[PDB]
Amino acid sequence: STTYALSAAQTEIWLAQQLYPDSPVYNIAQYTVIEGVIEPAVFEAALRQVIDEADTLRLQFIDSDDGLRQRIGTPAWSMPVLDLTAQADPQAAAQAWMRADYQQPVNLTQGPLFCYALLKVAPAQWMWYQRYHVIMMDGYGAYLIAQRVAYVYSALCEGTTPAECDFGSILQLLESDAQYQISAQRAQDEAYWLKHCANWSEPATLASQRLRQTTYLAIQAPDARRLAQFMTAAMAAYLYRFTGEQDVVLGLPVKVRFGADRHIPGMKSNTLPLRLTMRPGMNLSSLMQQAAQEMQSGLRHQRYPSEALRRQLGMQRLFGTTVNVMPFDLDLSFGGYSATNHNLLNGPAEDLMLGVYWTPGSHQLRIDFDANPACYTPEGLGAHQRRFIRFMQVLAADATQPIDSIDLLD
Numbered sequence: 001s002t003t004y005a006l007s008a009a010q011t012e013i014w015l016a017q018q019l020y021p022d023s024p025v026y027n028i029a030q031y032t033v034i035e036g037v038i039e040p041a042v043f044e045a046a047l048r049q050v051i052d053e054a055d056t057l058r059l060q061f062i063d064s065d066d067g068l069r070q071r072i073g074t075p076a077w078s079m080p081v082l083d084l085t086a087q088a089d090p091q092a093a094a095q096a097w098m099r100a101d102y103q104q105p106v107n108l109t110q111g112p113l114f115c116y117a118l119l120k121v122a123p124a125q126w127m128w129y130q131r132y133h134v135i136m137m138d139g140y141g142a143y144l145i146a147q148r149v150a151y152v153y154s155a156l157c158e159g160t161t162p163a164e165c166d167f168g169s170i171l172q173l174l175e176s177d178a179q180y181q182i183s184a185q186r187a188q189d190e191a192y193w194l195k196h197c198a199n200w201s202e203p204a205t206l207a208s209q210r211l212r213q214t215t216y217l218a219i220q221a222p223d224a225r226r227l228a229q230f231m232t233a234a235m236a237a238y239l240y241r242f243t244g245e246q247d248v249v250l251g252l253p254v255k256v257r258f259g260a261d262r263h264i265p266g267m268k269s270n271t272l273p274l275r276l277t278m279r280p281g282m283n284l285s286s287l288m289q290q291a292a293q294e295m296q297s298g299l300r301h302q303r304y305p306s307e308a309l310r311r312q313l314g315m316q317r318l319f320g321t322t323v324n325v326m327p328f329d330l331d332l333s334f335g336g337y338s339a340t341n342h343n344l345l346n347g348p349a350e351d352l353m354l355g356v357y358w359t360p361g362s363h364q365l366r367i368d369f370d371a372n373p374a375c376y377t378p379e380g381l382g383a384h385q386r387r388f389i390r391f392m393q394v395l396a397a398d399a400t401q402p403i404d405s406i407d408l409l410d
Contacts (some may be wrong), residue, residue, distance in 0.1 A: 003069035004174040005181070006061070008307035009268065012059065013135045013348075014068060014108060022105050025347030029102040030130045030142055036337025039157075040081045040125035045244040046153040047079060047116055054145050055164040056136045056266025061108050072171065074369060079381040090121040102131050102345050136346055141265035143329045146341060150332040157335040168262035168269040177257050180303060189304035190312065193242050196298065197273065197313060200355055203249040204239040205320030206384055207375035210349050213385055218363040219396045228325035229295075231356050233287040236276040237403045243392070246278040251322035251350060254297070256303050271306045271350075272298055273318045284399040317351070351375045383410060 006014065017026055051057045055292075060073040082097060084090040101115055115131040128149075132142060148165060155162035155237075180186050236248040253269040274294050276287065310318050332339045352375070355368035369385050387409040394406055 001071060003062070003064075004171075004178060006070055006357060007177065008305050008311070009120040010061075010070075011027045011068060012307055017105075017108060017135075021107075023064075024103045024105055025345070026134045027102045027106060028132050028134060028137060028139065028142065028346055029098065029344035030146070031098060031341045031342050031344055032128040032130070032146060032332070032334075033342065034126050034128065034334050034337050034339045036124055036335065038118065038334065038337075040079070040386060042156045042335075043118060043128070043149075043153055046156055049152055049162070050149045051077070051143060053148065053167050054141075054265040056141065056170045056264075057145075059113075059136055059170065059266075061135065063109060066302050067385075070174075075112065077114065077116070079116045079118065081118050083336045085120045085123060094119045094121050098129050098344060101129070105131055105149055108133070108135065126328050129295055129344075131344075136266055138266075138268045139343075139346070140269075141267070143341070144263055144265045147329075147332055150334050150339065154333065155337045156318050166262050168260045170266050172260055173264050173267045176260075180258070186304065189301035190308070192298070192301045193304050193309050194312065196275070197309070197318070200249070200313075200318075201274075203319050204243045204245045205315070205351060205375070206239065206242065206380075207320060207351050207372070208344065208377070208380055209369040211369065211373055211374060211376050211378060211381045213369045213378075213381055215369075215385055215389060217365055217367065217389060217393075219365065219393065220363060221396055224325065224327065224358065227356070227358060228323065229288050229291055230284070230396070231325055231392075232274065232323045232356070233276070233284055233291050234395050235321060235354055235388070236274075236291070237278070237284070237395065238388045238391050239321065240276075240278040241403065241406070241408055242387075248276045248278065249307075249319045250274045250276070251319040253322065253324060254299070254302050258303065270302060271301065271319075271322060273306075273309075274298075277402065280404060281402050283402050284395045287403070288399075320351045322350045322353045323356070324353060325358070327358050327360065332347050346370070386410070 013026060055072055058072055058075055059070050061070045062074060084093045087093050106113065113133045113136055115129065117129040119127045119129065121127055130142060130146065152162045232250060232252065236250055239248045240246060251271040252274050253271045256270050274291065276291060276294065329341065349372055351371055351372045353370040355370065357366035367382050367385065367389060371381050390409055391406065
């Protein structure tokens with residue numbers, strides 16, 4: 001059958017997994033606590049169908065003598081049914097089993113790239129364990145998969161025929177990427193991004209178990225694009241007021257659009273570098289304006305991948321801070337029983353990732369700081385989060401006040 005080339009990110013993932021074959025961070029993991037009755041045969045059938053619909057789970061990454069490639073195959077898989085009701089702490093035992101799974105490495109040539117499992121933790125409490133490899137999954141795709149599985153399971157339980165998936169096949173993305181590889185548009189994107197990162201020396205960073213720290217707050221003073229624009233400008237201004245460097249680079253993940261009308265689980269976002277210059281006397285207004293100008297001046301070349309741009313200049317990162325503004329993923333129901341999704345692991349982390357989580361019709365925000373241990377300490381990340389949020393609160397109260405006239409914290 002037909003084989004497709006891997007992306008630059010997938011090739012880097014392959015090479016890093018071949019370098020450190022015992023590192024388990026290239027596995028993202030998640031679990032779904034379900035408060036109700038779960039019968040495992042219906043769930044296994046739902047997984048059987050969803051794995052066929054989300055064909056990124058049926059990809060086989062093989063090695064050749066003419067290039068690393070991937071193919072759509074029929075990978076062998078299973079779903080264990082673990083019962084832990086007859087033990088003292090079933091929560092601890094289930095978490096230990098999960099931790100035992102996502103801590104052992106995964107071989108990419110011959111081996112299972114995902115893992116599904118069901119656990120008894122209480123008489124009416126089953127947890128669905130979901131592990132994937134970074135080479136074929138991201139968090140958004142995992143949530144899409146979990147939602148589709150919940151819907152299909154609820155449909156199969158009540159005997160109804162589940163509706164047709166709203167997923168696009170990964171082969172659409174593969175063909176589009178193969179045609180884009182030989183694009184003249186890709187050549188022009190490379191030209192633009194190379195002329196844009198011209199005099200770009202090492203960027204601004206606060207770099208002095210991923211360090212994760214959340215903080216809930218509520219600003220009283222729109223859309224979800226003004227929100228992300230404001231958070232980008234605020235993070236850049238904070239880096240400029242802490243490091244003293246006027247030319248701040250941030251990472252902005254965008255969802256590339258090439259013609260697909262559906263979501264393709266497995267298709268990842270492209271993190272574009274955003275360059276902001278801090279002139280004296282500038283305020284949040286002009287910073288927002290220049291950030292939007294940089295966004296829409298580089299959105300024309302959105303498809304050029306981050307990794308090709310990075311190693312087309314000299315590989316040690318294009319940016320140290322990433323802004324991820326997104327609403328929460330709605331809770332899912334399995335057959336009529338509501339479920340709560342819990343992240344077990346991520347792994348590949350930019351040195352600092354800023355995650356802002358908003359809710360429709362609400363003033364409450366959630367600020368997450370996911371950083372690299374070798375670059376931050378729990379006290380250093382906590383002090384930075386406290387300093388940035390108050391600095392960001394001073395920004396929201398007056399968009400006309402200059403950045404340099406704002407006082408910083410401890």
